[PDB]
């Protein structure tokens, strides 16, 4: 199969679009489905038209409480090398 990233051997080119799994490049990704290795154009997401008009409004009637995590590196290992003994 000929991509714009190069020539790809050993993967079948399907026609459906999934989320990206292993990036090949120039818009192509690969994944292990079903049992074989397939290559496809990635999808950006599901489509959605909003019911816009000039006198319509959507107002929520309930809510959820969400808790999510965020991880950040603060520090690293302090190392010294004696330049002469090295």
């Amino acid at each position: 199969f000929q991509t714009r990233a190069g020539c790809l051997i050993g993967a079948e080119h399907v026609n459906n679009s999934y989320e990206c799994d292993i990036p090949i490049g120039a818009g192509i990704c690969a994944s292990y489905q079903t049992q074989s290795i397939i290559a496809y154009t990635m999808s950006l997401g599901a489509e959605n038209s909003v019911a816009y008009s000039n006198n319509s409004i959507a107002i929520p009637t309930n809510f959820t409480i969400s808790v999510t995590t965020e991880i950040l590196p603060v520090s690293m290992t302090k190392t010294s090398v004696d330049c002469t003994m090295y």
Binding site: R4, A5, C20, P23, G25, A26, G27, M42, L44, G45, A46, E47, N48, S49, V50, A51, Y52, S53, N54, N55, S56, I57, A58, I59, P60
Partner: protein, 169 residues
């Protein structure tokens, strides 16, 4: 360094692993270039589309909305921007094409024209565009009647000021 000659290539082995380090460094900076784009543009879950009949209270977004007869389905102003700007060396392509990034910006732009700031906090909830403009006027400390009584003037000023970006570029 050697250019396919076994004499130079054997002498090079005496230098250890300098050339595995250099490749590791360049690979580490070529992966983060795609990470850079993913975090600016993939800020939506859905790809939102704008309605076919576009009446936004007098505001006119036609020079920044996608144009089907154009290359890569870009907006009119995204085109002016794309027109203004061997031996062991290769260039790798980016993971997202330019078509994909123009798709991402048109989904952001249709989300904001149509739902205000609600789609960045949850599900998109539609609201008429002038009522959204009135909420934004409230957010800077002006009352809403000042928008509703000056709607046509505010819309004309906005249209005429979007028309000047296009000239200056």
């Amino acid at each position: 360094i050697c250019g396919d000659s076994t004499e130079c290539s054997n002498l090079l082995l005496q230098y250890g692993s300098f050339c595995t380090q250099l490749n590791r460094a360049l690979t580490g900076i070529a992966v983060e270039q795609d990470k850079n784009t993913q975090e600016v543009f993939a800020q939506v879950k859905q790809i939102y589309k704008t309605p076919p009949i576009k009446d936004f209270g007098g505001f006119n977004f036609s020079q920044i909305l996608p144009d089907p007869s154009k290359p890569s389905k870009r907006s009119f102003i995204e085109d002016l921007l794309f027109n203004k700007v061997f031996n062991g060396l290769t260039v790798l392509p980016p993971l997202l094409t330019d078509e994909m990034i123009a798709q991402y910006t048109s989904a952001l732009l249709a989300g904001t024209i149509t739902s205000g700031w609600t789609f960045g906090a949850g599900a998109a909830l539609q609201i008429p565009f002038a009522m959204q403009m009135a909420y934004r006027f409230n957010g800077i400390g002006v009352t809403q009647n000042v928008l509703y009584e000056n709607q046509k003037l505010i819309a004309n000023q906005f249209n005429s000021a979007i028309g000047k970006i296009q000239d200056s570029l």
